[model samples]
Target: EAADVERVYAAMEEAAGLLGVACARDKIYPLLSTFQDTLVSVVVFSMASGRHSTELDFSISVPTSHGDPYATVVEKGLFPATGHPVDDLLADTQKHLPVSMFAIDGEVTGGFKKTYAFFPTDNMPGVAELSAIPSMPPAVAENAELFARYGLDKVQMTSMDYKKRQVNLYFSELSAQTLEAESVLALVRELGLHVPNELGLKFCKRSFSVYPTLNWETGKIDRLCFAVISNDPTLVPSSDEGDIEKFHNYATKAPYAYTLVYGLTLSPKEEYYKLGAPYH
Candidate 1:
């Protein structure tokens, strides 16, 4: 665990220097402290457009009693108050319950780019209210029965991608061997969405997601896009040399930065001990 943290830090530091975005050690360390003891997933660095701009992405298990994991940052002024109907929705639903998944993205400063959270159907509001939120995707009811048949009746993740003005739904924990090509096509078809015929046939070893563009002025759904993320090399087992090498190759790339080191015997560092204090 210590070695992984060291490697990740070294990699991120190198990437920041190369890209010229300010190293967000102060901002990032606090965020990491919140879930340093939980199941950390992935850390990604992407050049959104120019060499001077880069985005960092991270995902971690929701910590106990941490209402909305992004709440702290919002309070600290690194992220805007989600405000309005979105706040009311979160207030009623996720204050104490575990939301399953929480992912965030940011650059050096000027607030967060995204706050992605996943909740169970029971935690969400009615479909009408959900659809009203400009950033939320189609409701869980949109695919409830079909999902139940595949043992995936319990999750929906969405992100109000503030910077990009995009909304996405992530459906993880997939097993291609069980979810057939026909059913995959059926899943999208039922949503009044379209996918390339060939995409439905390919095995998405990891998971898949949907990106929908909403036409707010016309009050209609415009377009739905699908992505099948193949087996993530980062999660490759230690014994799997071939894929482990793939992770190593990714690690060496300057554009790839920050990793959420998890499933390790991590002893939370000093900063983590300070996480329980008041937001002020």
Candidate 2:
């Protein structure tokens, strides 16, 4: 615990230097004091061969993207498992309730918020115990048959190891001119499939093509932009679906549209944390 605390302080000092901000030792000590108090409370109970029943109480405020309150975790009392000393208790608690904390000082735009609680427990099962991996969709096998009808002999289908189920279609050596967004949408419609407005097709000046993944949560298409540097042009059609009519639903009325664009690049990478620096 002492070592962990030292490492955390060191990290803070390094961050301060990188951001060109001087976090005075006097100013930082109080934050460390609070952390030390919390650590002492937990560590003392850990050293005793006995169990110490207590609740970890703290509040966190985060910035949101929409000017809303930040998300937070709130927990109640925690108890040690039978015959387990400090390590066991800590493990049990973490198994049920993970702990993560961080801080940031920056110019926050619009923000969002949510609150949650953590609890510790034993007897929790692993992922395999929770549910069996779902079987592959019948469409995966049928994709070859469907593509064969379009004179597209090189269609390749594969499954992705994603928690949310996915299927990918790759068309190597596909001609960019043959894949206008409206034409592709018409083909999908002709096959009794739906085209989402956010759906898009793109042609690279270098003769390669690409289709990216769509994000259903935000009702937007994503990650499907084309990369021109590659040698082979590819058409990737993908979706996440379940067993019942839900799959059919997306197959029919997905409410988005897409088109071919000549010049575009991929989205920017997200940041880890934003310090109050001028040049973030």
Candidate 3:
């Protein structure tokens, strides 16, 4: 299925032209074929809320039948060695059954940046369940509160960036519930992390990410960053005409520092009753 892999790579090349950056084909392509099929692959170029300038990264998910994706990357040397405790924490979480899928996250620039591993949390034991384990760091164990309160016990994904010694919890499903602005504020406050008040409330309806930088040797959290992500596709449109116009104009004219590109097969929007519409 190299042809299937090429199809996604071709799409990424076109997107890279618009963003004016070269794709890290050498580092990324080697791992692409390890899986039999790829449902979707996305390339994201983000500005990190203007903190770290522009960073280009991508993530791809493959069916678990292809085998343990983490072991594949590790055997290939794409994943470097981490401290003993970090390794133990990762092992404990993945030991559970029925891993839905595995995703490999990578950087497209800066000389083959270390690839990170992402595991879906739905099947694995929740953070609160594993909090009592000796290897479970307090930084992660402490999230039991936010997880229970905000229905984040089944967060969509958890990222382990061993190179940076940081772990990120992604709350992608919270937008579906009766999550309120104050509940979001409370979660941030409990973590003792601060985000600009206005921005926090404005984008609170979308997904939230709880990222904690950890000290491997000491097992203490260096800092926690609570970020409200406004990029969920469901929230892009509104009933207000002015808002719709603004969204359309901004989408077409604005220079998006972060660009997410996926293949047409993933989510096909077919023409229903249109007289004349562009080909899909």
Candidate 4:
């Protein structure tokens, strides 16, 4: 947490004074508010009771952006309605649920909102000690018959920490392994992409799937489906682009779906996320 609002603001002012740039408390806030849309994107931690708030619970500007992603660990009876220490709250949370999610990267530990008076920097202090942070995805909750068919163990699901805003489900079986998890991670390391600033891939709501195929001719039938979320409100791409013909069935916006699906451009850069973070 910040020592006070004045703490970092004073630092920013001194830096501005030295640099001879136009700076004021008013100027800093709007700029910070401009870059970090306090309404649309800012994740606030305003001392709610332990039962995690629902996604629908947020006010008009419910936040969901890169690091400060949304989480649905809505276990109502987990914590006390009154008071609980930070450490105890984080510990019992993991015990109650198989997976306890944090909205941002550091949320896994301390769940600190960006208490800094600086720019939208991820300097939130790590208040709790964390050994593990569970990040399994819903698609593969357990070892599938697909894994048994190939004589391999269950798919291991993991993820990069908060700020990246990613979820990876590692699916494999027997000897049909095309990619190694280390290879995926090593690839993340080899190609250094800046997070939050220079995103390699966009389109906030999309995922890629790759599974073993038994020698196909002209590809398989479309297993794709999306129950449209209506119009007048005019929802996501699937609804808006329905009349475009075959648009809904495909994910053309994915940066690596074509590569991973088609075995075309096999490189690290084409892939994204699963990387920890790019160092300065």
| TM-score for each candidate, following the candidate numbering | 0.48, 0.25, 0.63, 0.20
lDDT of 2 by residue, 62-126 (tens): 22221211111102111112221211222232233332322221111111111211211323222
Tens digits of per-residue lDDT for model 3, 22-106: 7778876766565435533432332221112134455555455555555666777766556445555444555543456556656
Give the best candidate by TM-score: 3
Per-residue CA lDDT of candidate 1, range 137-215, in tens?
Answer: 3443453444456544223566555544444444444455435666655555554544434422442222343334432
lDDT of 4 by residue, 166-214 (tens): 2322222223232334332333243332111111211111222222111
Residue runs of model 2 more than 4 Å from their true location after superposition: 1-136, 155-159, 175-177, 180-182, 191-280
Check candidate 4 and list the clashing pairs: 105-162
Model 3 lDDT-worst window of ten: 271-280
- In angstroms, the error of model 3 at 190 is 4.4
**What lDDT does model 2 reach?**
0.27
Candidate number with the higher lDDT (2 or 4)? 2
Clashing pairs in 3: none
Clash number for model 3?
Answer: 0
| Candidate 1 Cα deviation (angstroms), residue 26 | 9.2
Cα RMSD for candidate 3? 9.7
Per-model lDDT: 0.42, 0.27, 0.45, 0.23
